[PDB]
């Protein structure tokens, strides 16, 4: 009936909830430990402030947050009714902040791109151009040396990451860099 | 580590108040809620209500008439009242904090309340 | 909701095993958290959501159960044992206690 789906911010600082569609209000019921195999309505909860956004979905913001904690949340709709549960443990819902400090370097010499800036890595690159086409690498591993066709031209480099588990999301991309020889 | 040390009177006079303050350290009364509990000599606990982490209150049905919980986050107290005591409200009262919503992981070390004239 | 534990008192010697339950008169999930209290001492949890130890708590404690029945379970036991043994549902409101079982140690 009603989705509420969450994130939690790269600095684990706390973790944004959102859905869409009476009075209604987002209720909480947050366990010592984890999510249950089948998420229910409990008799102890709280209430969360949440606001309405412009494109339409109710906002919600959980700080502090609990990483470890299972997060069991439904709406309750005035007699009274509850929408489904869901249960979220926000460690899982992490969206990491981006690599920074990225570097691309062309030695001559040596005849590479190198890149340099737990987690995988996705790694993007291509010609400094208009929209760029981009070919993408992945690492499982600090830093890569690519090849490229152009020793002298100009390439855009962006990194964006996840964990290397492959839970959560994956990081905006980097600003971009600008290589230089 | 997590601490609570409660603050009381010691004694209270028949149909007067007791104001006990729960001082506490090691965590956030806004990341988690206190309650208040009592042991009456010889019986069983009865919890009397808590003060969640976002500062709703639930009392237990038997005390509301005459309960209040509240709280200074700045100071990191709770503060139970509760009015017109006669003496079988004589008890060790206690604070304890919660863990979310499914236990209570700390006490407080409890403070003796003699009704009496 | 009602958490009653039936035995008052039990007696046990050093190095036996003990249970301890509590029933309740409602259906309470797990939630049921039990608390050992020394003379002259407040509680300290044991075990929480029916079965997880409290941290610190020695191996030698278990608890079990789910629904309306539940056990603490001492094994090994020791003299610092002595103590009122009770449970806490933590499911609905009011919270309840148990009455509690003290134990008594025979030397």
């Known amino acids: 009936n009603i989705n509420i789906s969450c994130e939690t911010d790269g600095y684990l600082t706390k973790m944004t909830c959102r859905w869409s569609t009476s009075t209604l209000q987002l209720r909480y019921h947050r366990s010592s430990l984890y999510c249950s195999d089948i998420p229910s309505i409990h008799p102890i909860s709280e209430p969360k402030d949440c606001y309405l956004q412009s494109d339409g979905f109710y906002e919600c913001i959980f700080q502090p947050i609990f990483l470890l904690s299972g997060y069991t949340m439904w709406i309750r709709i005035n007699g009274s009714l509850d929408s489904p549960p869901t249960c979220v443990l926000p460690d899982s819902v992490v969206k990491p902040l981006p690599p920074s400090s990225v570097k691309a370097e062309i030695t001559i010499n040596i005849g590479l791109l190198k890149i340099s800036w737990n987690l995988q890595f996705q790694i993007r690159y291509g010609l400094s151009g208009k929209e760029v086409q981009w070919k993408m690498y992945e690492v499982y591993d600090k830093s890569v040396s690519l090849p490229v066709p152009d020793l002298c031209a100009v390439y855009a480099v962006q990194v964006r990451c996840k964990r290397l588990d492959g839970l959560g999301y994956w990081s905006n991309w980097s600003n971009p860099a600008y290589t230089v020889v | 580590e997590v601490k609570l040390l409660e603050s009381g009177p010691g004694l209270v006079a028949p149909s007067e108040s007791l104001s006990i303050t729960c001082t506490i350290s090691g965590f956030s009364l806004t990341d988690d809620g206190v309650s208040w509990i009592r042991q009456p000599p010889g019986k069983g606990l009865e919890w009397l209500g808590v003060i969640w982490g976002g500062g709703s209150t639930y009392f237990n049905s038997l005390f509301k008439s005459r309960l209040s919980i509240t709280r200074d986050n700045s100071k990191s107290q709770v503060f139970l009242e509760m009015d017109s005591l006669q003496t079988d409200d004589t008890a060790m009262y206690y604070c304890?904090?919660?863990?979310?919503?499914?236990?209570?992981?700390?006490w407080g070390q409890g403070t003796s309340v003699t009704v009496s004239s | 909701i009602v958490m009653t534990q039936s035995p008052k008192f039990m007696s046990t010697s050093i190095g036996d095993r003990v249970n301890i339950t509590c029933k309740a008169t409602?259906?309470?999930?797990?939630?049921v958290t039990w608390y050992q209290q020394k003379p002259g001492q407040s509680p300290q949890a044991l075990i929480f959501?029916?079965?997880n130890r409290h941290t610190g708590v020695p191996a030698r404690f278990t608890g079990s159960g789910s629904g309306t029945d539940f056990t603490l379970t001492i094994n090994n036991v020791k003299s610092e044992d002595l103590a009122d043994y009770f449970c806490?549902?933590?499911?609905?409101?009011?919270?309840?206690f148990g009455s509690g079982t003290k134990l008594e140690i025979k030397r």
């Open positions: 304890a904090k919660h863990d979310g919503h499914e236990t209570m992981d700390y």
């Open positions: 409602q259906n309470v999930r797990t939630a």
């Open positions: 806490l549902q933590h499911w609905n409101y009011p919270l309840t």
């Open positions: 959501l029916a079965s």
